[PDB]
Design a protein around this ligand. Structure first.
Ligand SMILES: Cc1cc2nc3c(=O)[nH]c(=O)nc-3n(C[C@H](O)[C@H](O)[C@H](O)COP(=O)(O)OP(=O)(O)OC[C@H]3O[C@@H](n4cnc5c(N)ncnc54)[C@H](O)[C@@H]3O)c2cc1C
Ligand SMILES: [Cl-]
Length: 486
């Protein structure tokens, strides 16, 4: 008979899952498996992103239980667990969503050689991305595009991406009964305390497909806001209602399908003729995700500077003091320190908010390597995507794609043009709650009498600015011009 396995790595969803529909077709027993390493903390990861994964895993378990099935969370490594369950469950087909990451290509190639020895058919459909990224490189001549202007004109030449896959049946083939490896006491979704964490998460974004589909409809409640979306015109100092969709964590883990997001955008665009065009449009932002995935998958060492052909070699300085003050939110600038606080509390910031802290650390003030800043974002960001985190940090550090190093974000004026009262700063930095708005961006300029009255003395309660921007920026700007001369 047909007994299949639907492997969950990304694509933690039931909607638009071509790998799940194949594993349920003509099947007698389907096995939904998520391979979890219980020693992942003995090898860098925050409790916000990992608990976001667990909350997303409980969404699958509730969806499988409501359809007569059950999610299996197997412990160990995939190279050591799958050969055991291939013979124990009598598997003839293995389906999992395709992945284009470096570790995934080596991991999957190991699983492919194991299923061949066992006689298991491997089906790997694409659904994490809009298009087949390898197809885009072939149509473009064998090389991937390096500019958004050339990439946007390539996806328009191919046309619309494949429509989202249909929903799975309301009743799925359950796993076989009385299986030792499918025992609930060893295949249950663990909590954040049981995986080896001590402090609870503080984020306000709950993971899961049900939460992803709810935030999608909320974003589409106002179709005029969707059609007239322009990314550079959004408010980075908005936290009560974030001025963007905040769908990056659900798209990263796979709780939300990009194909369904793109299909919902065209329904609004077809009825709104004057809708925004890429790259500033909402569809353009998805094309940014497609563009970086196409370039990074074909470029070696895309997450590094050495051995990376698309990244310019820059003599980044080794300054642990500036790196520690930046990652611990004690640089003296309330606009920068509040964003880093929002990073360790929520795990998500506005794109322009990430622009200020990335510019301040790299080509702007501290001249610290973008890799050291990417590793800090890799820990706390609940939307940690290998290819976006890299191409965007190379963007803000003038290492790739971007080449206008004279544009330096002022860590004082940028936040003040959106929020002069400093509501964003008073929320994440409560030590400056009573500071007047006149000095809330430059607390060192406030008189001592104002510092005493507001309850925040610069040097005792809030640290002094580590650098003078006018002195640090001109130094970094001149060094970038000397680098580009090479
Ligand atoms: C230094 C730096 C690091 C970043 N690291 C990440 C990361 O690890 N993961 C991540 O998802 N994005 C990353 N980004 C991109 C961007 O900041 C986020 O995608 C955005 O803030 C998420 O908000 P949203 O979901 O409301 O986006 P929206 O504006 O609503 O866009 C919708 C979707 O489009 C995609 N998208 C939007 N902006 C970009 C972009 N600039 N590049 C690629 N795809 C984009 C995302 O999938 C996003 O969910 C980074 C940007 C910078 C400057
Ligand atoms: Cl500015």
């Amino acid at each position: 008979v047909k007994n299949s396995i639907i492997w969950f790595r990304k694509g933690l969803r039931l909607h638009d899952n071509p790998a799940l529909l194949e594993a349920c077709k003509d099947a007698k027993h389907v096995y939904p498996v998520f391979v979890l390493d219980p020693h992942f903390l003995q090898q860098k990861v925050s409790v916000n992103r990992y608990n976001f994964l667990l909350e997303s895993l409980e969404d699958l378990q509730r969806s499988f239980q409501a359809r007569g099935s059950r999610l299996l969370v197997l412990r160990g490594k995939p190279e050591e667990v799958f050969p055991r369950v291939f013979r124990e469950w009598g598997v003839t087909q293995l389906c999992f969503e395709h992945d284009t990451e470096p570790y995934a290509k080596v991991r999957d190639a190991a699983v492919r050689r194991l299923a061949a020895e066992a006689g298991v058919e491997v089906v790997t459909p694409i659904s994490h991305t809009l298009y087949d990224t390898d197809m885009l490189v072939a149509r473009n001549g064998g090389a991937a595009p390096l500019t958004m202007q050339s990439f946007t004109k390539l996806v328009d030449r191919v046309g619309d991406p494949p429509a989202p896959a249909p929903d799975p049946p309301a009743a799925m083939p359950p796993p076989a009964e009385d299986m030792p490896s499918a025992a609930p006491a060893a295949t249950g979704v663990p909590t954040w305390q049981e995986v080896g964490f001590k402090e609870p998460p503080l984020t306000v974004f709950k993971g899961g497909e049900t939460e992803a589909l709810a935030r999608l409809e909320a974003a589409f409640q106002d179709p005029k806001w969707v059609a007239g979306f322009q990314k550079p015109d959004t408010d980075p100092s908005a936290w009560e209602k974030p001025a963007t969709t905040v769908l990056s964590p659900y798209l990263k883990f796979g709780c939300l399908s990009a194909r369904l997001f793109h299909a919902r955008l065209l329904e609004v665009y077809r009825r709104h003729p004057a809708h925004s065009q890429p790259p500033v449009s909402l569809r353009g932002q998805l094309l940014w995700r497609e563009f970086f995935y196409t370039v990074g998958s074909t470029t070696p060492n895309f997450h590094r500077m050495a051995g990376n052909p698309v990244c310019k070699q820059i003599d980044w300085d080794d300054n642990p003091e500036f790196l520690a003050a930046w990652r611990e939110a004690r640089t003296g600038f309330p606009w920068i320190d509040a964003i880093m606080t929002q990073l360790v509390t929520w795990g998500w910031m506005h794109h322009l908010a990430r622009h200020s802290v990335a510019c301040f650390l790299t080509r702007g003030d501290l001249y610290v390597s973008w890799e050291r800043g990417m590793e800090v974002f890799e820990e706390h960001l609940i939307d940690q995507d290998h290819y976006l985190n890299a191409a965007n940090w190379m963007w803000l550090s003038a290492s790739a794609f971007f080449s206008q190093y004279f544009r330096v974000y002022s860590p004082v004026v940028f936040g003040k043009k959106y929020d002069p009262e400093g509501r964003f700063i008073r929320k994440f930095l409560p030590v400056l709650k009573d500071m007047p708005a006149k000095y809330i961006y430059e607390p060192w300029t406030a008189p001592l009498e104002v510092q005493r009255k507001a309850g925040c003395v610069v040097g005792r309660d809030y640290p002094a600015p580590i650098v003078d921007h006018a002195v640090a920026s001109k130094a970094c700007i001149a060094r970038m011009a000397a680098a580009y001369r090479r």
